[PDB]
Design a protein around this ligand. Structure first.
Ligand code: HEM
Ligand code: HEM
Ligand SMILES: N=C(Nc1ccc(CCNCc2cccc(NC(=N)c3cccs3)c2)cc1)c1cccs1
Ligand SMILES: N=C(Nc1ccc(CCNCc2cccc(NC(=N)c3cccs3)c2)cc1)c1cccs1
Ligand SMILES: C[C@H](O)[C@H](O)[C@H]1CNc2nc(N)[nH]c(=O)c2N1
Ligand SMILES: C[C@H](O)[C@H](O)[C@H]1CNc2nc(N)[nH]c(=O)c2N1
Ligand SMILES: [Zn+2]
Lengths: 407, 411
């Protein structure tokens, strides 16, 4: 019931108790581990509300005060009457910061307490949503000095008036299937790109076309909006040694901003809650650029480097991978757009785990996601035992809106 | 019940039913995943069901389930258990059991090879000198002048737990480690404690950076005894780089034959506490882990200095650059000397084909993602993108406590 995690490089052992608070289920059982699977009423609501308010009042050292008891009663009376309740601003801020704190797949959580929370619960239309979003993009971008932020649209009601951003990230590139059978642009976004087109977007049909936003307010049909180009900070990718690299014509955007997740606080569900931070270099260089199902540029780069591509054992893929990632980091740094390398990010996360173990009694972490997609064992997280469990408030996956929406 | 796994690169979806045969527990529950935790004397009572389930599996594999031979064997094992408290495996069952323990090893990326395993039966062994001889024969056989062949040697099973056979070495061939008065380590830091036990037992340490450790062998629960492997049987590869001529002057080498000697083999309830097995290396084991772990040889700094990389900031990726060059060096060296090695690209590609094969013919393939994905260049290998289900099947290889922690010294 009290669990130990060991770091095998430093021998440091931590004891975890925080997991006993866990309420949600993992997918695993005593007989089978599913650690590597990507996706494993009035009655229901009051316990969820009480669990949340208890931790909130505990966090401000007011557990069991009249202010605590009164709030419990007020929310209780509100659920009984309205079948829902509203969070105070202070609770909403706390809940959003803790959903990040609890995100077991996030290596950047040393930052969790510095999150700017934009309350967009007064929003009613897609144009209103667009305005909030552009304001978020501009705030977070901060001319390259990126700042973490979340914008929180109205909470789920009867479920037929959902607010949704249809985009998977606020800023992402289009993918087009070609007459050839090849793919132009980002193949991850082919389907959404076609949804935009069929909704009415005039696609440039290039390699790096910023997708328009598709915004759904109040369960209404979603509407298209172009993000002002001036708000989309982009980085041309060059190499500090290889002159020819810039002629690959690579670029990426500076602001990573997830927009398809669901934020759960105190049993209330926020289906539109776009949040942003900044990139770890490997996300672009290893995953966006080198995944076979993504821009898949390893072949073209290795050719420019004149490496022996005859045999896998020459490690030509590995050599080309390192250079692509050097270029990504060099380009962002040269343009003064915030980025973190995997060495620095993982070192930070280890320090964060140690803070959380002493200040909180644990830190849920999903090793499969936390270890970087290159150079695993030369980062300290590789050698760190981690316990994965689900705490609330949380960010959760939700079905893509096009399978769900009734037009 | 059916469980599906998806490859996120190919969209190939697989359906697992083999997990239904799993009995041993994982460490995980509905409320906690322990998938990254390194480590998460039987009665007659528990023994016959274990034996029965094993023999049912064996008889099924040879297409003789329910035959007169199957039934007579069950009855004979039953009689042997209730009268002698244990039983003996037939040679064929032993071979089947050792191969299946490998087939079932969820942390093993080399399992495409599982059916080609040379099994040496050393159950007639009685003394440490007998064990030494068996082990030398195994090394010579497996080494085969560089053309490595997989093999396992199986010493007598546990009886009362007071007469265990044990190889104290963690691998048959491994380098010594020496902690100096100034707190630095000479040689391999992983083997410091074991090196210290060898010295105490009487080993004359050469005290260099790559001294092959003596074997420390325990027969029949007796105090272990020291033996030196004949150096002529220990194939070693000097490490050089195809382009960087200064690489050789780092003075690096490694042994060709990886041979695990500290695991326990469980077949039909029987426990084989000394069962050394060997195959060949995947390059990253040496180049990433043995050479570049901070707690091992730790050569990254010296390599990047010699490459004159920018080391002032981690964001130059000097470590990642030095890492690739060392791993190229390892593969180049082994290939040039004609010693079997597999690169992590080839090994993971083969594993994915193995795994798909197993899903089709066997109904599943238990795999531990944390272990299967190589320690460098993770996502450019196909396993990174493969969902895997981890569960425990018997026969199996298991960890066991280091023998110096539990041994009753006779003096
Ligand atoms: C401040 C800089 C941050 C860094 C460097 C960072 C780093 C990362 C990285 C690298 C991932 C893996 C993504 C992938 O492989 O697809 C991730 C996952 C995640 N992070 Fe962050 N993070 C940051 C800030 C944030 C913020 C501000 C939030 C929310 C408020 C957040 C919540 C998450 C969540 C929920 C996941 C998991 C997503 C999923 O399961 O698909 N992170 N983090
Ligand atoms: C034929 C060539 C083989 C290759 C390339 C290979 C590859 C590997 C590698 C790279 C590991 C991980 C080692 C580590 O990180 O510590 C491993 C684990 C393992 N393999 Fe193999 N393997 C081979 C043959 C064998 C054989 C012959 C057996 C036994 C009959 C075996 C049983 C295991 C077991 C039990 C583990 C898990 C060890 C542990 O949990 O500590 N493998 N395999
Ligand atoms: N369809 C897929 N499934 C899939 C499932 C889950 C996800 C989650 C990806 N999330 C994007 C993300 C989330 C969190 C952080 C980041 N990166 C960042 N640095 C930040 C974003 C926001 C704050 S920090 C990116 C992606 C694909 C595939 C993946 C690969 C090939 S296909
Ligand atoms: N003491 C540790 N704990 C630890 C726990 C388990 C293991 C297991 C190591 N197993 C060695 C091994 C096993 C299986 C295969 C190989 N390599 C091979 N290619 C083969 C060996 C035999 C057949 S194939 C090596 C090692 C250390 C630490 C490691 C790193 C920092 S601390
Ligand atoms: C199947 C496997 O779980 C999947 O490929 C995971 C592995 N680890 C990951 N880690 C991160 N950070 N992001 C991912 O998308 C993945 N993909
Ligand atoms: C804590 C973590 O589970 C530990 O470092 C593991 C990770 N994956 C591994 N994978 C392999 N093949 N070998 C290992 O020793 C490890 N170590
Ligand atoms: Zn698990």
């Amino acid at each position: 019931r009290f669990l130990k995690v060991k770091n095998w490089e430093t021998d440091v052992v931590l004891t975890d108790t925080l997991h006993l608070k866990s309420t949600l289920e993992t997918g695993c059982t005593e007989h089978i581990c599913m650690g590597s699977i990507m996706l494993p009423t009035k009655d229901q609501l009051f316990p969820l509300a009480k669990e949340f308010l208890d931790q909130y009042y505990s966090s401000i050292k007011r557990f069991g005060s009249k202010a605590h008891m009164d709030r419990l009663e007020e929310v209780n009376k509100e659920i009984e009457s309205t079948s829902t309740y509203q969070l105070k601003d202070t609770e909403l801020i706390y809940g959003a910061k803790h959903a990040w704190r609890n995100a077991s797949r996030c290596v950047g959580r040393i930052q969790w307490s510095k999150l700017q929370v934009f309350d967009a619960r007064d929003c009613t239309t897609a144009h209103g949503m667009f305005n909030y979003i552009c304001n978020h993009v501009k705030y977070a971008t901060n001319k390259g000095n990126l700042r973490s932020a979340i914008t929180i649209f109205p909470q789920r009601t009867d479920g037929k008036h959902d607010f949704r951003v249809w985009n998977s990230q606020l800023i992402r590139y289009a993918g087009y299937k070609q007459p050839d059978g090849s793919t132009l642009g980002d193949p991850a976004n082919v389907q959404f790109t076609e949804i935009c087109i069929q909704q009415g977007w005039k696609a440039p049909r290039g390699r790096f076309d910023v997708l328009p936003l598709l915004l759904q307010a109040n369960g209404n049909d979603p509407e298209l909006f172009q993000i002002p180009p001036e708000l989309v900070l982009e980085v041309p990718i060059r190499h500090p040694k290889f002159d020819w690299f810039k002629d690959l014509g690579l670029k990426w955007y500076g602001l990573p901003a997830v927009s398809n997740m669901l934020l759960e606080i105190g049993g209330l569900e926020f289906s539109a809650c776009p949040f942003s931070g900044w990139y770890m270099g490997t996300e672009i260089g290893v995953r966006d650029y080198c995944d076979n199902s993504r821009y898949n540029i390893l072949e073209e780069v290795a050719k420019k480097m004149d490496l022996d591509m005859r045999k896998t054992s020459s490690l030509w893929k590995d050599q080309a991978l390192v250079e692509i990632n050097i270029a990504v980091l060099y380009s962002f740094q040269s343009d003064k757009v915030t980025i973190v390398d995997h060495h620095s990010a993982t070192e930070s996360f280890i320090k964060h785990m140690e803070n959380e173990y002493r200040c909180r009694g644990g830190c849920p972490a999903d090793w499969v996601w936390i270890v970087p997609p290159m150079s695993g064992s030369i980062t300290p997280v590789f050698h760190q035992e981690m316990l994965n469990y689900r705490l609330t408030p949380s960010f959760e996956y939700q079905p893509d809106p096009w399978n769900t929406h009734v037009w």
